[PDB]
Structures are given as C-alpha cells and as structure tokens.
Amino acid sequence: TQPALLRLSDHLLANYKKGVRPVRDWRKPTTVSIDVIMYAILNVDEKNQVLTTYIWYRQYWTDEFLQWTPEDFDNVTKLSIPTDSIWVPDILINEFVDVGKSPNIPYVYVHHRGEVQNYKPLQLVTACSLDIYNFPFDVQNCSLTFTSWLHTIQDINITLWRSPEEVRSDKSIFINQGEWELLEVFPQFKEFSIDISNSYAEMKFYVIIRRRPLFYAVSLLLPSIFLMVVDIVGFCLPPDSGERVSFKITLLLGYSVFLIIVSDTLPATAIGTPLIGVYFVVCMALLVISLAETIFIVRLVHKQDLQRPVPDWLRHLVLDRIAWILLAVRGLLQELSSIRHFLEKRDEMREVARDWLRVGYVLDRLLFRIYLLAVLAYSITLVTLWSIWH
Amino acid sequence: TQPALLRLSDHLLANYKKGVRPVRDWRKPTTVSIDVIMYAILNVDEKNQVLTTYIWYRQYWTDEFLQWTPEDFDNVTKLSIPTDSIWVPDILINEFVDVGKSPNIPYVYVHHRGEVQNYKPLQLVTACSLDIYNFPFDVQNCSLTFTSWLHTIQDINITLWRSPEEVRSDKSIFINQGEWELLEVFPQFKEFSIDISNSYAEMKFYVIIRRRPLFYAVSLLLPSIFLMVVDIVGFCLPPDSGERVSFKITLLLGYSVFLIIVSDTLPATAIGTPLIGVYFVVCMALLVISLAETIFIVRLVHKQDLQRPVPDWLRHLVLDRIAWILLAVRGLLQELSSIRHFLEKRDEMREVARDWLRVGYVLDRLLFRIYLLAVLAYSITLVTLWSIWH
Amino acid sequence: TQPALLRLSDHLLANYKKGVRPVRDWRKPTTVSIDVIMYAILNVDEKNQVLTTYIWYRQYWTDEFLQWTPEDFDNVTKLSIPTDSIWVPDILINEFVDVGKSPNIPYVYVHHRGEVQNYKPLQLVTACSLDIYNFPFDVQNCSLTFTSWLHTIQDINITLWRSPEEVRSDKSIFINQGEWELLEVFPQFKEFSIDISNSYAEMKFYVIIRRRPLFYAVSLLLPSIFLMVVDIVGFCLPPDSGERVSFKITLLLGYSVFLIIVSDTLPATAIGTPLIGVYFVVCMALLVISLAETIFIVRLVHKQDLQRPVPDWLRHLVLDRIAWILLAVRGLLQELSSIRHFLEKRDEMREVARDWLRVGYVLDRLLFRIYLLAVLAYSITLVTLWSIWH
Amino acid sequence: TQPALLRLSDHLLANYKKGVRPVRDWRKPTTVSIDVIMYAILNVDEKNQVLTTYIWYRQYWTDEFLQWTPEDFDNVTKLSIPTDSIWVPDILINEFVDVGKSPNIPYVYVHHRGEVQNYKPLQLVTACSLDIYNFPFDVQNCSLTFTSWLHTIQDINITLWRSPEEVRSDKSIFINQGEWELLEVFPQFKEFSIDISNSYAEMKFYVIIRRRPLFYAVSLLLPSIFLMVVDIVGFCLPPDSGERVSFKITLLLGYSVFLIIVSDTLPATAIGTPLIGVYFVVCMALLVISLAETIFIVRLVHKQDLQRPVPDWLRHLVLDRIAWILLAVRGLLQELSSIRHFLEKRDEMREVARDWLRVGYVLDRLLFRIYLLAVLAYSITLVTLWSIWH
Amino acid sequence: TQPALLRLSDHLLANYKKGVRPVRDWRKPTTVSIDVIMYAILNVDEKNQVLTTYIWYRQYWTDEFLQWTPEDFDNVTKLSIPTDSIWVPDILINEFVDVGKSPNIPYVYVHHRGEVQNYKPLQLVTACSLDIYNFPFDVQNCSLTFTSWLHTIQDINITLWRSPEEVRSDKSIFINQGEWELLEVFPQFKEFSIDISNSYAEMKFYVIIRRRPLFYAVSLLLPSIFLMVVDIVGFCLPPDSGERVSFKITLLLGYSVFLIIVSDTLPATAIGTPLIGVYFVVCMALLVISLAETIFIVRLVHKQDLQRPVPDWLRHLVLDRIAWILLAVRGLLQELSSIRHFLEKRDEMREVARDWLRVGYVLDRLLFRIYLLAVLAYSITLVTLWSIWH
Ligand SMILES: O=S(=O)(c1cccc(Cl)c1)n1ccc2c(N3CCNCC3)nc3ccccc3c21
Numbered sequence A, B, C, D, E: 001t002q003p004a005l006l007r008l009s010d011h012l013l014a015n016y017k018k019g020v021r022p023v024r025d026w027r028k029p030t031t032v033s034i035d036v037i038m039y040a041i042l043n044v045d046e047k048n049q050v051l052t053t054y055i056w057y058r059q060y061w062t063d064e065f066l067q068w069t070p071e072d073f074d075n076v077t078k079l080s081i082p083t084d085s086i087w088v089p090d091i092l093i094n095e096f097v098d099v100g101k102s103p104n105i106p107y108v109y110v111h112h113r114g115e116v117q118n119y120k121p122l123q124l125v126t127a128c129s130l131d132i133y134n135f136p137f138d139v140q141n142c143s144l145t146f147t148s149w150l151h152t153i154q155d156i157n158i159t160l161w162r163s164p165e166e167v168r169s170d171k172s173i174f175i176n177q178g179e180w181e182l183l184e185v186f187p188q189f190k191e192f193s194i195d196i197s198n199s200y201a202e203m204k205f206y207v208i209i210r211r212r213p214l215f216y217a218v219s220l221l222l223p224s225i226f227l228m229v230v231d232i233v234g235f236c237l238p239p240d241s242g243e244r245v246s247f248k249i250t251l252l253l254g255y256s257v258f259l260i261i262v263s264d265t266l267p268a269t270a271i272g273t274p275l276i277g278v279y280f281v282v283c284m285a286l287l288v289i290s291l292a293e294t295i296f297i298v299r300l301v302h303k304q305d306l307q308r309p310v311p312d313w314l315r316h317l318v319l320d321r322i323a324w325i326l327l328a329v330r331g332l333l334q335e336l337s338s339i340r341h342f343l344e345k346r347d348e349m350r351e352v353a354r355d356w357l358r359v360g361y362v363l364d365r366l367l368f369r370i371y372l373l374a375v376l377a378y379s380i381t382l383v384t385l386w387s388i389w390h
C-alpha cells in the first residue's frame, strides 16, 4: 500500500539509536573499510610545514541494525539514509593542525545486508616534515594517518576498500598541471599503542609529491646568467678608463639586491638551507673575485708621481713568459739646459707610467682569460649536473 | 474555516519523511532540472589554479509526496515550504576545493503537482587548469560539473531547465566591467562511470572567460618603451666623455630592477612561461647589445700611451667605405733639438689618439644607426602583432 | 493568575506554524517595509570591485496570526518574541558576492495588531562598478538591492519605512572621519521581471560615496614636486663638469623607482586608467626632456681634438641674437719655429674649444630658462585645475 | 530521595518558556548589570579605523521564574543552568563592524532569589575614530557602547556591577607589554533616544589606550640621524674633487628610498597627516639645501676657460671680511717672445682659476659651519621637544 | 534478548539530564583530571604577541549517573556515548584571544563506575609575553591555564591525569623539525581567587620553546660578512684614483638598503629591541669610519693649486716615525728666463703635490692596517661569543 521506501525507512529508523555502536555482540568490532583518492594539492607551505590537500574520501562499515529482507519491501536492495540519522565512525587524521572547510554530504547508501557507504570530499590541512635540501627538485613524502580518535582496535578497526596497488596507482582525477606532481599514494597499516590494552588501529597513506623545477628556472637561472654575461662584457673595459671599478661595484650591487629579493621566495628549514644557496654564494664569490682583480689591475696601472720603474723580475716575467703564454752664450745655455731637464723629468715619469700600464694590460688580459675559463667550467659543471638528473 | 495555507501545510508536511527520496516507485529516478547563471568572477588565481565565481543557481524536481488538488484548499496552486522540511537533492560540484560562503535561502516553492523550485546563490571556489601562454590576452576555459555526490543515475538524474543555447547566450546580470570578460557558459551532459552499474549523471558548464589586456598595458609597455627611449637618448653621448658607460650600466640596473619587480605580477605555470617573457628578454638583449657596443667604442677611442697607429686596412675601410655609406752655438742647438724631440713625441701621440678617436666616432655613428633601425623594426613588429589580434 | 507575558506567549506560539506565510487570505501579499541606515564603509576594493559596508537594517511586516486583544492579557500592547519562532521574510541583497559576518538578533517586537519589527545589523560584501577615472577625487555610486530571493510580488512586496527624503538625509550615526565620505542614500523602487507573471519587487538604495583626496596628497604631490625641485637645482651644474649627466640619470632612476612603487597604490580598471597617470607621464616627459637637453649641451661643449671652428651661422645666431634676447743661427731658428708651431697648434685647439664652450653655455642658459618657464606653467595649470574643483 | 540538583532542575526548567522576558509584571524592566574587564588589545588598525580587543564580560539580571526556597532542595543556594535553557538579554555593542570569534560558555549560575550570572569572554572588532596627529605618542580614546539592540528602556535597562571608580582602576589581567598601553576604562550611562517613547539604555566604556613610542625609535630616528651624520662626513670632500655632487645625489637617493619605504609603516587619516611628516620634510629640505650649496660651490670653483678675474667687491668681501669672521737675432727673439706669450696666457688662466678656487674654498668653509650650526640647532630642538613630553 | 549496548544506552540515557552537574551530593565537586600533549607550534607571532599551538587534550571526570553493574548487561565494562548527550565541564584556557578551529570529537568513553573519558584535539591561539632580547637564540616561556570559566573550586576542581614529571618529559609526538623547538611542558596548580569564597581552580602548563638560530644565519651573518669583505677589498683602491669615495658611498647605500629590508624580518617589542641591533649598528659605524677615513685621505692627497708645502712636524712624523712603524743677447736671455720661471713654478707645484700624496699614502696604509685589525677583532669577538653559547 504505502511506498516501499517510506515503509523501509519507518521499519529501519524507528526505535533506532544513533549513539550506539551497531553490533549485536559488543565483543566484535566494526571493521571500517577505507579508501582515499587525491584530487588536488592546494598548498605546500615550507615555512610553517603544513600541507593543504583535497581528497575524495569514502568508507563503508557493516551496520547490523540497518538490515532487512528485500522481498518484504518491493525488492528494494539499497536506499539513501541521512548521515545524521545513523551511527558514523569518528575516523579522522592525526596530522590535522586546522579543520578543513569541505562540503557536507547529507546522505549515505545503506544495503539490505547492513553495508553503509559514506562518500565525502575532505580538505586537509596536515603537518608534515618538508625537507627542501633539493628545493628546486625536492620530492616530498607526506603522511596521512586515518584512525579513530577514541575507539580502540577492539571497537573500530580500519582496512582498505581496494588493494594497496590499486590505491598506489590511482592518478586519474588528480589535478596535474599545477606546481606539485603526485607520484603515488602508498597505504600502510599499523597498530598505534602506548599501553598493553589500548591499541589503536590506524591507516597511513604516504602522499609522495615531486616539485616541478620549471617554475623557478626563469626566476633563478636567468638573472644569474644575465649578470655573469654583463660581467664578462664589462671586463673588456680598459683598466685605466676610470669607470671599470664603478661598473663592477654597480654590478655587484645589482646582484646583491637580486639575491636579497629572491631570498623572499627561497624557503629555509631547521636541518639546513637549500643546496642552491651554495651555487648562489659561488656566483657571489666569482663576482667578488672579478672586482678584486679589477681593483688590483687599477692599482697596477694608476698613474701617480710616486711610481718607480718596474722591477727587473716583474718586467722579465710578465713581458716575456706571460706574453709568450698569451760671453753670455753660456748664460743662454743654462736656461735651455734647465728647460730640457724639466722636459726630461716629465718624459721619464711618462715612460715609467707607460711601462706600468703595459704590465697591467698584459696581466689583465691573462686574468680575464683565466676568469672566462673558470666561468665556462662552472657553467659546464652546472649543465652536466642538471643533465644527470634529467 | 482555517486558513488555506495552514491547512495545506498541515496536510502536506504531516507524517512526511524528509530522509526518503520522493518517489512512489523506487525504480524511477528523480529528474533534477538544473540552471546556472553567472553573476561575477570574484578571483582567478593562476598560482594555485583556483577559480572563484558567484553564480545564481536554481533547480526543480518533482516531489511525488507534496501533491494536492487546489479545489480543496481555496484554489491555492503554489506555496512556499521551508527548505529544511523537504527532501533536497545533494547536487554539488566535483571541481570544489573549498566551500563557498553563500547566503542560505530558507524557502522553496512547491506547486500543486509536486514541482519544487529551489533558488539559491552559490559562491564557488573550483580548481581549473589555467594556461597563461598568452597571459595578457589569454582566454580561459573553466569547467563546472554539477552531479550528485552519492546517488547514481538510477536515483538522481540531471537535465537542463532551459535549452543549451539560452544558457549559452545568458550574459544579462553578469558584472562586466571587471578584469575578466565572460564569453559564454556552455552546458554539456555526460555519464560519469567507472563501473558497469555505478553510472553517475553529471552536467558540465564550460565557463569561458577572456582577460582584458588593457589592465597591464601601462604596467608592461610603458616602462619598457620609456627605458628604450632613454637608451636612444643616452646613445647620443660622446664615447670619450667618460660617462656613457656609467649611463648604460645605470640604465641596465634600472631595467633589471623593473623586470624583477614586474615578475611579482607575471604568473607562471608548469607547462610553460608566458610568451611575453620572450619579448622582455629580447629587450634585455637589445640593452645588453647597446652596452657592449658602448664598451667596444670606449675601447677604440680611449687614449693611452700604448696606442699604435691605425692599421692600413682599418683606416681605409672605416674612413672611406663606411664614411661613404654614412763655438757654443752647436751646444745651444742640442738643447733645442731635444726640446723639439719631446714636443714631437707628444704631438705624434696626440695625432695617433686623434686618428683612433675619428675611427671610433665613425663606427659609433654607424652602429647607432643600426641599433636605431633594429629598435624601430622591433617596435613595428610588436605593433603589427598587436594589430592582427585586434 | 499566570503572568501576562507567559499567557500571551502560550496563546500566540501554540499551534503556530513558522513555515506558513502569515496571511488568512493567500491572495494578498505580506507588505514588508524596509529601512536602511549606513554605519560605516569598511572597505572599497577597486581591484575586485567589491564594496564592504556595515548598515543598520530594520523591517516590519504585518503577521496576521500574532494578534490579540490587550484587555485579555493585562493590557499588554507589545512583547518580544524569538526570531526563530516566527515566519521571517527572506529579504536579501542581489549584489551579494560573499556572506557578511554580523551579530544575530534573537528577538523581534510584536504588537497587538500583528506588526512584527525586526532590527538587525548587517555587514555587506556587495559587488559594484567602481570607476576610478578621477581616482583622487572620484565619487562612487554603489547600489544595494533588497528583494525576496524566492517570493514574487504577489507573495512579498517591499516598501519604505520612512519617506525617501528622510532616508536620503540620514547621516547621523555614519562613521565620518574615515577615507570615504557618504553623500546620500537614495531609495528607489522597481519591479524586476523577466516573465509575464514572475514579477519580483525590489528596493534599490543607491549608496553614493566620495573619496577624500587629502589621503594621497603627501603620497603623490610631494615626491613629484620634490624631484622637480632637485631637477631645477641640478640644472645649475656646469655642462662641462662631467657629472651633470650622472646627476640627471640618477634623478631619472629615482623618479622611475618612485613611479613603480606608487603604482602599487594606484588602482586600475578595464574601462580606463586614472587620469593622474597622464600627469605622471607628463612629469616623466619633462624629466626626459631635461636629460636630453643636458646630453645635447654636453655634446656641444665636450672638448675633443676633432672639433672644428664654430660655423658662421651658429656663431652669429647664438652669440648675437640669443645673447641679446637673454751660420748656425738659421739652424737655431728652425727648432724655435717648430716649438712655436706646436704651441700655436695647441693654442688654436684650445681657442676652438673655448668658442664651442661659450656657445654651449649660452644655449644652456636659454634652455634652462625655457625649462623653468615650462615647469612653472605646468605647476600653475595644476594649481588652477585643483582650485576649480575646490 | 532523588538528587537535590536533579529535583531543582526539574522544578525550575519544567514548563519554563525561554522566549518570555522573566517578569511577573510586564511593566517593570529587567535591570541588567554589566561589568567589563580588558584582557588584551589585539590590533589597532588606523587604516580602516577598527579596534580589535579581547575583554572579559560578565552580566547578571534577576530572573523571576528561576526562584526556589533552599530548604526544600537540601539547602542548595545556587546551581549551574545551561545558557540555552534560559532567557538571556541581547546586550551587544553598537560599535560592532564584524563579529568576533570567542569561546561559548555553556553554563550560567542561578541563585535561589533569581539572580542569574553570565560570564563570557568576548572578542570585539569595533569601529573607532583614530587620530594619529601625534602618531608616535598618540593616545586613543575608543568607545564601547553596550545596549539592547531591540528592547527599550522600559524592557531592558543597564547598570554597572561595580562602582565606576573600580571599573576605571581595573588593570590587573590586562596584557601589558604589547605595543598599546591601557590607561583606563571609563564607564558612562546615557539614554539613546530619537523618539518620544523609544528610549534605549546604553552603557559606554571609554577605552583609553596610549601607544608606546619606543617601538618606532629605531625605525625613524636611527636612519635620519645616520644619514645626517654621513651628510656631515661627506661635506668634508673638496668641492673641486669632482665626486662631491655624486656623493650628495647618492645620499639624497638613499634618503628618498628610505622615506618611501617608511611611508608603508606611517599611517594617515582624513583629518590630517601625522606631525612627524613635518620633521621628515624639514630633514629633506636640509639635505636639499646641502645639495644646492654643493652645486653652487662647484659652480664657483669649476675651472673653465671662460673664467674672468674675480670682481673687486667679491674678492674684498670674501677674502677679508669672511676670512676674518672665520741680423737674425731679431728673428730668434720673435719665436721666444711668442712662446713666452703662450706660457703667460696659460699662467694667467691658471692664476684666475686659483683665485676663484680660493674664494670657493672660503665660502664652502663658511657655509659648512653654518650648515653644521643649523643641524645642531635642529637636533637640540628635537631633543628638547622630546624632553618636555617625558 | 535485546543487544547489550542498546539496553545499556537505554538504561543510562533515559531520564538523564545533561544540564545537571553529575553528583548525588551537591556539596562534593567533580574532580576533572587533565592531560595535555603538545603536537605542533603552528605560529609564534612576536608583533601581536600571540602563540598558535596544536595540542592533544584529554580529560576524565567521575559521572555518578552513568553507572551500572556489568553482570546485568552481558559483562560490558565500557561503552561510547555521544558528547552531546552527557554533561561536559566547561574547561577552557584563560589566555585565549581567538577561538581555534579544531575537529569535533562526537564520542566519549564511559566506564561502569562512571569514569567518562573525553579525548579531543585543540588548536590554541593564546596571548603570551614574547621577549626577543636574544631574538636569534631566545627561549620563550608561554603559559596555558586550564580552568572552568564559571564553576568555582567547590563545583569543578582540576588535577593532572599523569604525574608532573611524565607531562614534563613528553616529547614523543611533537612535530620537531620546525622553527621552534619544544623544551618541556611544566604543569603547575594554583587557586585563582579575588574573593573570600569565589576560589577558582586552575592548571597552568608552562610551554617552554627555544628558537633554532640556524634559520637566520644565512639571512643575517652572510650579507654583513660579505659587505665587510667587499669593503676590505675596496680599501685597496688608491685614494687619488677618484673612484674610492664613489665605491664607499655605493657600498654604504647597499648596506643601508640591506638593513632596511632585513628590518622587515627583525621583530621588536616594547621592553626593548633585540640585542643584534647593537651589532648591526656597530657594523654601520665601522663602514662609516671607513668612509670618513677615505674622505680624509682624499682631502690630504687631492691636488689643487692652493696646496702649501708639508709642514715640518707632519713631514717628520709621518715620513719617519709612522714609516718605521710600518747687444740683443740680453733680450734673448730674458725670454728664456721667463720660460724657465714658468716651468719652475709648475715643477714646484708638482713636487708639493707629490709630497702630499706620499704623506697621504703612508697614512692610508697605516689606517688600513688599523681598520683591518679592528675588523678582525670584531669578528673574533663575535665568534667567541657564539662559541660560549654552543
Ligand atoms: O598513552 S598516552 O596517554 C601517552 C603517554 C605518553 C606519551 C604519549 Cl605520546 C601518549 N595516549 C595514548 C593515546 C592518546 C591520545 N589519542 C587517543 C587515540 N586517538 C588519538 C588521540 N590522546 C592523548 C591526549 C593527551 C594525552 C595522552 C594521549 C594519548
């Protein structure tokens, strides 16, 4: 007479207590079968070490009070029952540090043998240990531990809806083209217990994610390479021009402000700084070495009246070995003699300055070649290190 | 006797179970008809790849328990019933990554034949794949998938309130003068199923939005064009002035800090960087070429005592082809001869410096003309590329 | 015997259905009277085009079930009834894009003739079209539309508690000394309908707000005026000092970084950039013109050995019109003749350089006077434009 | 037989209506006594003019239905009753602009004569007029107004739990070592009414808070003093060095970027800018005056061939008053005469340059002393202004 | 017949009042035992002085109404009861300034003797006094005070689940690899009372946390050390080069912008600035002393025509003590005499300049050695200060 669904709901939900664990025998536990599918990785924050993810969570447990024979209710084998009208296990993650805002699913499926299926999306804000030692190429290993917060293993036990390999290989609906790439979700079962009898069943899903380094390529490689290129270009200025040192100090200031600004996007952790800091300080050291070379050559070639003739050893070395590597008539005569003396003194000072300038030019050429070779070696080493990771 | 609305509500809502799917026959599904109208696009986030929109959502389904004959209730054909007192389908979006804060509508309209109409505004925070390859002019294609989270197609099915063309052409109440322009909302129906029998009905609304490029015109074109203009202006400084290199390095530092600052507003994605990065690095390369030309000409024209006479080939080439393209009396005599020798040496050095300066000036003029032509060609290419898109 | 309030509440709220529209005749609508008073303008966001305001909202409608005769209840004419125990119209704003967090008022006043008065504070996050074409002095015109989300005009109709002039003139409790100044709140009634019979009653309150320009006076006028002042000061440096160009380029870099930083506080919209951008780029053009003038004069006065005597036309023009507007004895003789020749050549080069320097100085004086006049004219024009708006 | 608490709760809460104002006579009001204790000042935002505070709020009113004789219930004189089971006045603050997240207290104490005590912590986000005219040393005067949102003075009246002096002197549990120091909380009672009969009782607590200036001492005084010190140091460079103007312009750029950056932490209001802006622009004007003095002296001492002998008046003044304040033999003769003429011309130019350099040096010394005296006077004035405030 | 759990729940929760404190005798209090385990320190905020932590909180109290004999219910000794169906003490923290978002645990364990165990995770936003006097190495001492907000010690009393040593030594599940290291959690019991009879029981957990200084090592030590190194490198430039002062001022500008930027990450408090500010201003003073030395030596060695011969005392001192520490024939003769006079004057000026340059060079060498020794002493002092803390 009455609709089958209405009669079934009246038969089930009448005198049904939602605060009672649904077992006819209190000794057996309610085995909750669990399944997790990753949807998206909303945020990985290396500063506070929290991982924000969106997952599709489903679970099913056998409710021994929501049972009926289909033949008495017009052959209905399953129906939807509100989640607030039945007992629901309190399965939640240990790693929680903040409650996620997720849509509330008001209905759950109940079968004629008691199986209750609960589908629900969950947004998770979980704490994790984020090691950024390989920051541009780091692969993270985050853990999600689903366990009952109160019930022991003798009340609520947790298993997997699907085989572990199927959960591992599930990468169908994951949002992929973001910053973080999901590798696998590995489920593992352990019994957490710090007491002889208080054993708690937990299910650990090791969410393994790999960062995509192409995000930071333009941000990191381009400015440093550009500034080394302009350093090489500016090395060509003559040392005695009087502007080479200004060029070098301006370039060093530019690199310093670049490093200080990029430090806002480079994370840090307690165990250690990311390894690319070593490369950045190596580039800083190369720029400082270039500046020191410029200052030394400027010292060599600067023309001041205290200059003395180039020593024999320095002259021979630089200009040979390094080069091959690379009556009132008497009263009238006195005034002319004095004028000639002054001109000779000026000419001798000019010649000494010329010799020092030649030595400085040869040394500058040699040191520029050495610096170019060092820069090429550093770039080749970086390229060959990047290649093996590919 | 009693008011018609009160009697109707008592007749309907008495012994009415809100946890039961409203069908007299459990085999037929409840066909939920759906309609979506876009109101505003609150935020498009290219970093986390989430789209925030506000939509006006209405749905109607046939409730087979909320039926009456109007003649028995003073000819009432419809009435408002609280949303919490009736069964409501759990239609929600798959793309959800965060629950939106939207006003709660407490009433729904119910007709005398069971049709229940639910009007509700929804704020959506949905994940989408944002491709910014054409960042200033990119058109996005975001999907909204409305489906029942639990019920299969044999329980809840989804259709459209209006024809697909009407939903596509709906741009009436959309907030238009913002950053993002709505092109169309294209509805499509698919059956999502990863099981033989567990088929789920879904309705996909492809929200297609086009960015307005005029937002970033002042931010991008103006600084680069201004810095190229000042580069052209500063190219006029004489190479031997001793300040041209300082001008060029200061300009390069300014452009570098501009690029680093503007990188904070330029988004990036895993698949690739926006194409305007190519244009920006081309402008950087042009500035670097200008600096290298300045340094080369400074090398040519710098006056130092090691200068040798201009070679025959270089002199002929630059100054012709490129130009057309563009007794104690004897003792007295000795001192005078020495003075004349010193003056002649200084004059010869000055003349050699003059020849080198002339060659450098001619080369600088030619290279300035070439650089101006290259800049004009680049600007014309950019303008003609912008024209075809208009 | 029993307290009058208890008896009255038992008489009213017993067998009272809160899901029924309170009319004895379903044909007549419930006329809801609305009054709105602005408290504060929490935030006006020109980027996402959302307006955040706090208002004091009160409404009253005639409930035909909450009626009694005072003489039967100890002459009680009004009482407070919980808001959750009575029917409340679902009046809410169309412009909503996010739900506002506002305190919940648990009680409403009910009179003996059915009038139910609902007082409630509301925080509103509404979308609006913000035109910043006159950004420092722009007056905004935001609309708040109160209407029933579900009920048509035949069920719920909306009017005004007070006359439109009284609502317009209400500026008593508004927080005034903030950034935004409230001009008026203009109420207007319209019938929103996109169907023959589905007519919806709405009440539009045009919130008109004017920005106070004194916020940005120090932020905008002071840096630009200061940098023009230092440009005028630095124009006094001699062109041949060798540091005027460095001064000008440093000043231009400072103005560029100022503009880039201040762009973070200058909003932009799709329809167009704020008009003060024109003034800012005019200041940029004036600085660039100053730099170009400095470079031109440096070109004129720079002393290099390729200098030729000043042409007759240029000399006459600049130095008149612009100025008015503003035997071994023979062997001994040969060496002396050669020395005299060298000294004469050097003196002639020095004299040519002196003539060119004089011409450059006169031209620099004239162009400095012209630039000062142009700057004064620009400042006077800005002051006059500001005065007429006052 | 039964427990005393259970019997008392059954006697009280049975047939008890929580929607009725608890008075046997509706003519008398429920006098709510209010006490407020400040816990912490979470945030004072001068931009949006909102004050965030945490307070400990307690109130007690006489409930005439929750009365019993202790002798009938095992001498129980008080008990805890859930807040949701009794009538609670809707006392809330007018100044609210956002609802505060505060813990919910589920129990209230009820005495045997009806006194109901409600203890609750409250987080308040209230709008206030923040005058920052004395920004580093400003004392704010914020108002908290507790009143019933609906009930008039004939229904709910408000008084103080403690005497006003006790509320004023309460600074025990306030968090003190933060940025803001609490001076006093002054309670005042007023009757808010804009109608003859609609009088509302309100209680205003004037929260008076004084900012601690030691927060911004390092941020403001240190950079300006340091840049003044380096300005004084750089004033010692010789004017003819050719780098003094570059030093001054670099220093000016540094101060400009410092001011622009510190503007991000200096708030502004509609009524007026903070007074320390005057001091900052005075420092800026001092730096500009130093730059102008440097440029003027550079103009005086610059050596160019157009220099003319120092005028008699300038020479006398600067160098006295300011200083005290601080045959082929004839053919042979012609060539020597010409050489002597050239040397004499060069020597005369050098002597004129020397005289101008001496005048410039004396003037530079005098102006440096004047500038040092002005800087010392400004620093002394600032110190003596700070002393009187201490 | 019926399931044991259902019968037990019916026996307990029937006619059970959840608003009544569960004691058969109202004179005895409900002794709540408290245990707290720290999970993670989400955020320590020194600006607003708030501490955000996640803790695992469990409590148990004896409910005298939830008691049964196991033999009558199939030997059930414990069961799970919903938290909303029983009386729960209102234990919450005094230090709260904002409510934390934590998962809600819906079940609590109840034993057959009345013991009710409540497990719950809590996110705490508590105010604390953060002293950053030793900012890089500071250890904080934050207090968490658990007490009943309403009930006095005669109603609810608080003790510890475990011994204080066990609570102190608990560092098992704390997230350790973050910025903050947990030292211990020290529980202490006090009776808070400001009245003769209104005594409140409270339990204080002194959360003691130590910051890990390795976070800021790269951010602080590296830039200052690098800028000192480049200062030492640039000290080698010859004083008469004309670019040493420009190098020094550019370096000072770089250090100034570094300090201004790093001030954004250096917190400040009312009681005092962090001690590393002293070291930073010492580095500033060292750089300023270097600049002043450079300016002084530039003054000494600058060549201008007003130079006078080096005084006897200065010459002797610097060049000895500091060095050891480190007829028409007559008409023909007149012209030659005049030429010789001019050449002699120029030579004498050159010789005076040479002597002054020698003195300046010796003084510059000595002062560079002194500055290097001072820098080495400062670095050694910093290293030895860091060693003793290790
Ligand atoms: O044995 S313990 O007292 C213990 C003793 C010493 C070190 C440690 Cl680390 C633990 N203990 C065991 C589980 C557990 C728990 N969980 C119950 C199961 N679901 C998650 C919450 N919360 C707690 C909250 C506060 C204090 C203790 C506990 C606790």
Ligand SMILES: O=S(=O)(c1cccc(Cl)c1)n1ccc2c(N3CCNCC3)nc3ccccc3c21
Binding pocket: C035, C036, C037, C056, C057, C058, C119, C170, C172, C173, D147, D148, D149, D150, D194, D195, D200
């Ligand atoms: O007389 S008024 O209409 C009036 C007329 C003209 C200017 C002004 Cl400023 C007020 N009026 C008086 C109190 C009051 C009120 N409070 C009731 C007491 N608790 C706080 C809220 N809310 C309102 C909300 C909207 C409109 C009016 C009011 C209002």
Ligand SMILES: O=S(=O)(c1cccc(Cl)c1)n1ccc2c(N3CCNCC3)nc3ccccc3c21
Binding pocket: D035, D036, D037, D056, D057, D058, D119, D170, D172, D173, E147, E148, E149, E150, E194, E195, E200
């Ligand atoms: O004696 S007091 O009036 C008092 C008098 C003078 C200075 C001080 Cl500092 C207190 N007083 C004692 C406890 C207490 C309290 N707690 C009850 C126990 N749990 C936490 C909240 N809230 C309050 C809220 C407002 C006003 C007073 C109190 C208060």
